[PDB]
């Protein structure tokens, strides 16, 4: 059972701007997704200090980066707090509306797309490099879900029957044909070192087989 939803108009407008604007410094998408994973890990770590059973779904707090050239995907996995169905359908977009308005105003005043994370909407930078984004996520208080969007105004949400993940989020970036440099080990290593060198969780870059 797949449910289809319309983005709010303002979020659709943000996604079109990210897809259509000429902007060569695309590599910042990875910093933004790693930052979001770090924030999700911070959140489960803090909650676990008052309820240690919140880690019954997995004690390890980490970020994995997994390129797959055969599927042309780059997957960012974290064992953070995860997202509920309400987060995926309503809550994240509600918060993103105000950050989007502020980001758009900043761009008109001279900011550039690399500053997107200062407005809280860095997730959508994934569309600098991905034609489709699939998010598999599991929060302790809800079931495992898959969110997916190729932009164009709509997204889907379904219960996920694939390999259970325990807790956290996997962001699967289906890369555009001209963005396969982000599958190369040396390129991902360069980007992590430049923009994510002080993240407080282990980041493992998997190697392709
Ligand atoms: C990683 C998933 C995610 N993070 N931020 C947002 C905003 C809207 C929709 C989704 Cl799936 N998001």
Swiss-Prot record:
ATP binds at residues 36, 78, 97, 123. Transmembrane segments: none annotated. It is found in: Nucleus; Cytoplasm; Melanosome; Cell membrane. Residues 1-209 are annotated as: Interaction with NR3C1. The modification N6-acetyllysine is found at residues 43, 69. Disulfide bonds: none annotated. Changing residue 32 to A: Strong ATP-binding. Strong interaction with HSF1, HIF1A, ERBB2, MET, KEAP1 and RHOBTB2. No effect on interaction with TSC1. ISGylated. S-nitrosylated; negatively regulates the ATPase activity and the activation of eNOS by HSP90AA1. It comes from the Eukaryota. Changing residue 78 to A: Impaired ATP-binding. Strong interaction with HIF1A, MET, KEAP1 and RHOBTB2. Loss of interaction with HSF1 and ERBB2. Los of interaction with TSC1. Homodimer. Identified in NR3C1/GCR steroid receptor-chaperone complexes formed at least by NR3C1, HSP90AA1 and a variety of proteins containing TPR repeats such as FKBP4, FKBP5, PPID, PPP5C or STIP1. Forms a complex containing HSP90AA1, TSC1 and TSC2; TSC1 is required to recruit TCS2 to the complex. The closed form interacts (via the middle domain and TPR repeat-binding motif) with co-chaperone TSC1 (via C-terminus). Interacts with TOM34. Interacts with TERT; the interaction, together with PTGES3, is required for correct assembly and stabilization of the TERT holoenzyme complex. Belongs to the heat shock protein 90 family. Molecular chaperone that promotes the maturation, structural maintenance and proper regulation of specific target proteins involved for instance in cell cycle control and signal transduction. Undergoes a functional cycle that is linked to its ATPase activity which is essential for its chaperone activity. This cycle probably induces conformational changes in the client proteins, thereby causing their activation. Interacts dynamically with various co-chaperones that modulate its substrate recognition, ATPase cycle and chaperone function. (Microbial infection) Seems to interfere with N.meningitidis NadA-mediated invasion of human cells. Decreasing HSP90 levels increases adhesion and entry of E.coli expressing NadA into human Chang cells; increasing its levels leads to decreased adhesion and invasion. The TPR repeat-binding motif mediates interaction with TPR repeat-containing proteins like the co-chaperone STUB1. This is Heat shock protein HSP 90-alpha. It comes from Homo sapiens. The lineage of its organism: Eukaryota, Metazoa, Chordata, Craniata, Vertebrata. The gene is HSP90AA1.
């Amino acid at each position: 059972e797949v449910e289809t939803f319309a983005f709010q108009a303002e979020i659709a407008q943000l996604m079109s701007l990210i897809i259509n604007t000429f902007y060569s410094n695309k590599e910042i998408f990875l910093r933004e997704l790693i930052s979001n994973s770090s924030d999700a890990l911070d959140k489960i770590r803090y909650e676990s200090l008052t309820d240690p059973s919140k880690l019954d779904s997995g004690k390890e707090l980490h970020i994995n980066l997994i390129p797959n050239k055969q599927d042309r995907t780059l997957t960012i996995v974290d064992t953070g707090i995860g997202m509920t169905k309400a987060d995926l359908i309503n809550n994240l977009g509600t918060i993103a509306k105000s950050g989007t308005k502020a980001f758009m105003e900043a761009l008109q005043a001279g900011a550039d797309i690399s500053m997107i994370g200062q407005f809280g909407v860095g997730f959508y930078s994934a569309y600098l490099v991905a034609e489709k984004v699939t998010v598999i996520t599991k929060h302790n208080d809800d079931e495992q879900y898959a969110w997916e969007s190729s932009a164009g105004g709509s997204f889907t949400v379904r219960t996920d029957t694939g390999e259970p993940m325990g807790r956290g989020t996997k962001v699967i970036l289906h890369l555009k044909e001209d963005q396969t440099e982000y599958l190369e080990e040396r390129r991902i290593k360069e980007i992590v070192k430049k923009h994510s060198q002080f993240i407080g969780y282990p980041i493992t870059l998997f190697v392709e087989k």
